[PDB]
Amino acid sequence: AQELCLYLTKAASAPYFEVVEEHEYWDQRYTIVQQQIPSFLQKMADKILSTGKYLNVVRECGEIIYTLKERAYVEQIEKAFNYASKVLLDFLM
Amino acid sequence: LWHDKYTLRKSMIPSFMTMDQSRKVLLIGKSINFLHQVCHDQTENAFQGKIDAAYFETSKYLLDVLNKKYSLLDHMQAMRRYLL
Numbered sequence: 776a777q778e779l780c781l782y783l784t785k786a787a788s789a790p791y792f793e794v795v796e797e798h799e800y801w802d803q804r805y806t807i808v809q810q811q812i813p814s815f816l817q818k819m820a821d822k823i824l825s826t827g828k829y830l831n832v833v834r835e836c837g838e839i840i841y842t843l844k845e846r847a848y849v850e851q852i853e854k855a856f857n858y859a860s861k862v863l864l865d866f867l868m
Numbered sequence: 869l870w871h872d873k874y875t876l877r878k879s880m881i882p883s884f885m886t887m888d889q890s891r892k893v894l895l896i897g898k899s900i901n902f903l904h905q906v907c908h909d910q911t912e913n914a915f916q917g918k919i920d921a922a923y924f925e926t927s928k929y930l931l932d933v934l935n936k937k938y939s940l941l942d943h944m945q946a947m948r949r950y951l952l
Binding site for chain 1: 904
């Protein structure tokens with residue numbers, strides 16, 4: 776029943792990992808919801824929100840798997856946030 | 869993360885592991901648990917050889933990440949020049 780509950784969460788997470796709530800001057804656009812935090816990404820609750828936020832101020836202008844005691848996904852997020860800024864910061868200089 | 873959060877349970881040690889071997893696992897586990905969180909980094913007779921193989925590699929790597937990414941030695945010398 777640990778192979779099963781890994782088959783569900785592997786499929787019940789593809790929609791989430793293909794898109795933090797948005798709104799409609801820029802600190803009220805996207806804001807963290809505190810309840811719905813996985814409590815194993817709580818360490819990086821600020822780099823996720825900061826990673827996509829930089830992608831939108833440029834867009835409107837013009838794989839992850841869960842493992843225990845292994846942080847292959849915690850490292851995978853830092854490898855994209857370290858690029859999310861290098862495209863926007865360079866976009867303003 | 870070294871002084872506390874790890875306790876050698878004297879009661880649940882199997883008889884087929886000597887009391888000294890039980891302090892080399894509590895030290896290899898602690899060496900890897902501490903290497904991830906604080907250091908911010910991610911990676912019979914054959915049984916006795918496995919513990920020592922996991923010891924002479926993990927600890928030797930803990931110093932490398934603690935001398936190149938933090939220069940633990942370069943502070944001991946610098947803490948003598950000024951503070952002493």
